[PDB]
Design a protein around this ligand. Structure first.
Ligand SMILES: Nc1ncnc2c1ncn2[C@@H]1O[C@H](COP(=O)(O)OP(=O)(O)OP(=O)(O)O)[C@@H](O)[C@H]1O
Ligand SMILES: Nc1ncnc2c1ncn2[C@@H]1O[C@H](COP(=O)(O)OP(=O)(O)OP(=O)(O)O)[C@@H](O)[C@H]1O
Ligand SMILES: Nc1ncnc2c1ncn2[C@@H]1O[C@H](COP(=O)(O)OP(=O)(O)OP(=O)(O)O)[C@@H](O)[C@H]1O
Ligand SMILES: Nc1ncnc2c1ncn2[C@@H]1O[C@H](COP(=O)(O)OP(=O)(O)O)[C@@H](O)[C@H]1O
Lengths: 48, 489, 496
């Protein structure tokens, strides 16, 4: 004719937010992004 | 899609006061300038879900031509507590740009819960963003916010204080004429015949929420399609389950005061107490205190106690709290006195509403200073019964019935005018009441009129009415056997 | 390799309910559905795990030539919120351009559980997008979403509204006529077989679902290879005892949970008690065989029958033959089995079986040995008597508070019929006063027809001689005169 009562407790979280390895950024630089319409980029030649 | 004002009814008394709350400050904002005060910003709605809470906001939006912004409850709160505060900042900024505008939100209990002992949720950073956003913006801007929820008491009390959500409306279940109006709306396109009824089809439902009317019409229409390779509405009630399935709002037995006979010292003595303050309260405010809540029923077993329980509950068409005898579940030591209090507060919210109990008088056995006793139940739950029964209010006029079969164990503190005081002995049905009970029960039987029940009343002298119900059951069970041996030959 | 037309036994009597919601929007929208009724799109398949829905949804796509999809519950929802939304959005726009299409969803309970104690809000994000995308497809999109789960009560009640999910079809466990086609499919791929029919082996495998039957043909085929090690394919013809070996090491699907199947007991296994049999053919069989007869008079039949007598007769043992005749479930509870150990721990354990008694209908519930509850009304005035007054009003209010239109019945059989509670012998709860004594002395030869049939001397006059000797012999003691055959005749006949 009796009872059992017990509560609980929690811990939410911690974070660091660590990212961006160096090998991904070196591949991130050597690319293209697009050029409007007529914004050619050119070639050039010389030094015969 | 494109809904209007004439698509829903029942809450027309509340629909008129809504049209002066969200259309009058938007169409005429200069009327509040002449009176000086600011127009109200927040009005919320509640009730059972599926009475058209989301369809009501879309009806008044298309009938005004204003901007209609929508933020869903369980959608924007499921993010990682960083984009919800910017979505609410984007909500009020876009509504200010294209004024006049309304803002409809639904399921605000999922956004704004209450603070309780079970801490561990987020419960912050989103509703506090709504607090600092709503208290401003009142520089005669044509913007209003409309909230919608299911449980109106799980909301945080900081919202319903002042200036944020001050006006409330209670769109509940419709009446018998309310379901009759939505039956004509949902059957405007189905080519029915002349055999269907509308008043009898609405009266045979008696507990159906407005979302069921679209489902019950499509179930009967699908049955009519299947017979090609129109009274199929009664087939749809036997197949489909009504909404609010396993709650305390059950209504499936439609026994009225005609189907129950006799006991004229109880029918007029129940009309004196539970129909007079709920219909004519103008005389009760100048002739003492209004309500006569408690009433007791005692007598022999099977004397017709609960036969009149659902009969009075369907006369005024109010709610019927069907709490059984051992409903004090008593899983521990403290919740056994607490689970009886929220059902009393629910009776005050849905007032007037009849509450039923059975044999909960246990303070005569709860003597002081002994050894044989329980661990906190059946001796301290009567101390809660000595303080939660007379918790009355003049704006509710509730009433509670009580049926027992042992009037010798009545507590000396429960037979009091502050408790259930009106005790009425339910006697045996005499030779005049035996005909009034049994003839109303074989009304559904297509019987022959040669057999009169006066011979049954002469053969039953000390029989109860439930024992007479076995006689018409045995007469019907052998009429089934008379019908079984009629189609095989 | 794809599925055939039907390809599953034990479902052809209910496969039309899933089928008829498919062709009727497309094969006739002019004369059948242009009245102004929108097509229902949400169905709900459920049942025990192993009835084969996943396939059943493949069979209706092959029979109609419609496009098929595959979405698993814990698979797509285990991705990110934006990732699961993009897979959900790209599946419905793909289904629009190839109408008719079938979108199969499985395991709804993992996506939408109940909200009684499941705290947190990560589940309500994805189920709000499912109800959103099910609305704007009104005009000509021939799509029917198939939701697959196990229990119908575990799904949220918000999903069962108008237009979202309407059809709740339940493919059940097949009988011997149903599972015979399942054995016919998984044996036509075999080279040879025995000269014994498969219905003789499927008669004892009653509570075996048709996913286990696909394994038992393979479970006995490998023992045929293990028995040896057309030159090695002559052993591939399975024998009737290797099925018994497969039944000897069988893992029954009903054994993995509680056993609630219907036993194969009948009325010819007992001798006598025919006055009870003619009374117990009207109370629970006439509502379920002729459901329109009691609705003509508007009076439902009586729910509840009470037995009382000596513990020797079969009053608790013949009640299983009452429910199993019309294939109803049997739940047997005992009086002094569950009680109030702590305080109030019995009334919650009484109404916990009433909800599942009407969900899986037809079921019955068998209350037995009421000499621990129905004896205390005004006699016991102790502390246990105060707890006795709290436990007897639970079942007294539940006898008239139960739903009597869901063919749920109580059957009682209790000794000591003098001190029964007076509020349980009232009509409506227990009104069939049927006394069950020991059976008659001339009806005791018909008891022994079940257990033994083969006797080279054919007795039956000496067994009635000791039956007619005295009236004090019980209905179970004379059944034990052939239960002692292993001590009488089988003992001295196996030494060879
Ligand atoms: N006057 C009315 N009363 C009740 N139901 C109506 C009425 N008019 C239409 N209905 C039907 O009821 C449905 C309204 O349900 P609704 O869209 O409000 O769901 P809800 O669950 O109440 O909304 P929420 O998700 O905000 O709780 C409509 O689909 C419509 O067919
Ligand atoms: N006016 C009446 N007089 C006598 N019997 C009635 C009357 N109306 C209905 N009855 C029958 O009596 C039964 C009422 O039983 P109920 O359990 O409600 O009260 P009861 O028999 O007094 O039970 P209890 O003794 O537990 O209070 C119904 O099943 C009904 O058929
Ligand atoms: N008519 C039939 N009834 C029962 N079982 C069948 C039938 N026909 C084939 N089977 C066998 O039963 C299996 C079907 O099980 P299924 O693939 O549906 O698993 P399931 O657990 O039901 O699916 P889900 O993962 O969606 O729950 C098949 O592997 C098949 O061999
Ligand atoms: N017609 C019958 N004649 C003799 N014995 C029977 C008969 N029916 C059942 N039994 C025996 O009685 C048992 C089932 O009923 P029983 O256990 O006697 O219930 P109770 O003990 O409550 O009377 C079975 O084990 C069976 O052997």
């Amino acid at each position: 004719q009796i009872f059992v009562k017990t509560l609980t407790g929690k811990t939410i979280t911690l974070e660091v937010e660590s990212s961006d390895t160096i090998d991904n950024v070196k591949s991130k630089i050597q690319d293209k992004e697009g050029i409007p319409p007529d914004q050619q980029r050119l070639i050039f030649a010389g030094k015969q | 899609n494109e809904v209007g004002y004439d698509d829903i009814g029942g809450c027309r008394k509340q629909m008129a006061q809504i049209r002066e709350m969200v259309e009058l400050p938007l169409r005429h904002p200069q009327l509040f300038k002449a009176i000086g005060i600011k127009p109200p910003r927040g009005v919320l709605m509640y009730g059972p879900p599926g009475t058209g809470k989301t369809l009501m906001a879309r009806a008044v939006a298309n009938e005004t031509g204003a901007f209609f912004f929508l933020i869903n409850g369980p959608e924007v709160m499921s993010k990682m507590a960083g984009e919800s505060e910017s979505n609410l900042r984007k909500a009020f900024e876009e509504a200010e740009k294209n004024a006049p505008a309304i803002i409809f939100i639904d399921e605000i209990d999922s956004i704004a819960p209450k603070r309780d002992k079970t801490n561990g949720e987020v419960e912050r950073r989103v509703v506090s963003q709504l607090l600092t956003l709503m208290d401003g913006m009142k520089a005669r801007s044509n913007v209003v916010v409309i909230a919608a929820t299911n449980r109106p008491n799980s909301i945080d009390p900081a919202l319903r204080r002042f200036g944020r959500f001050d006006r409330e409306v209670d769109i509940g279940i419709p009446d018998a004429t309310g379901r009759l109006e939505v039956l004509r709306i949902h059957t405007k396109n189905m080519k029915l015949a002349d055999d269907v009824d509308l008043e009898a089809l609405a009266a045979e439902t008696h507990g159906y929420v407005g979302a069921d009317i679209a489902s019950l019409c499509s179930e009967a229409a699908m049955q009519q399609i299947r017979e090609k390779m129109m009274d199929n509405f009664r087939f749809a009630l036997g197949n489909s389950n009504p909404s609010a399935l396993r709650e305390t709002v059950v209504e499936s037995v439609n026994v009225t005061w005609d189907d129950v006979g006799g006991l004229d010292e109880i029918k007029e003595e129940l009309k004196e107490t539970v129909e007079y303050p709920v219909l004519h309260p103008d005389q009760y405010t100048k002739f003492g205190l209004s309500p006569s809540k408690g009433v007791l029923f005692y007598g022999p077993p099977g004397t017709g106690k609960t036969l009149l329980a659902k009969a009075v509950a369907t006369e005024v068409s109010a709610n019927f709290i069907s709490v059984k005898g051992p409903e004090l579940l008593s899983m521990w030591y403290g919740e056994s006195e607490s689970n009886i209090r929220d059902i009393f507060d629910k009776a005050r919210a849905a007032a007037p509403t009849v509450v039923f109990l059975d044999q909960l008088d246990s303070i005569a056995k709860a003597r002081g200073g002994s050894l044989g006793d329980a661990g906190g139940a059946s001796d301290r739950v009567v101390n809660q019964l000595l303080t939660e029964m007379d918790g009355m209010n003049a704006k509710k006029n509730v009433f509670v019935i009580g049926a027992t079969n042992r009037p010798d164990q009545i507590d000396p503190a429960i037979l009091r005018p502050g408790r259930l005081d009106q005790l009425i002995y339910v006697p045996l049905p005499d030779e005049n009441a035996r005909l009034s009970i049994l003839n109303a029960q074989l009304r559904k039987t297509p019987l022959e009129p040669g057999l009169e029940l006066t011979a049954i009343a002469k053969a039953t002298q000390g029989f109860s009415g439930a024992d007479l119900l076995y006689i018409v059951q045995r007469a019907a069970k052998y009429a089934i056997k008379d019908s079984i041996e009629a189609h095989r030959q």
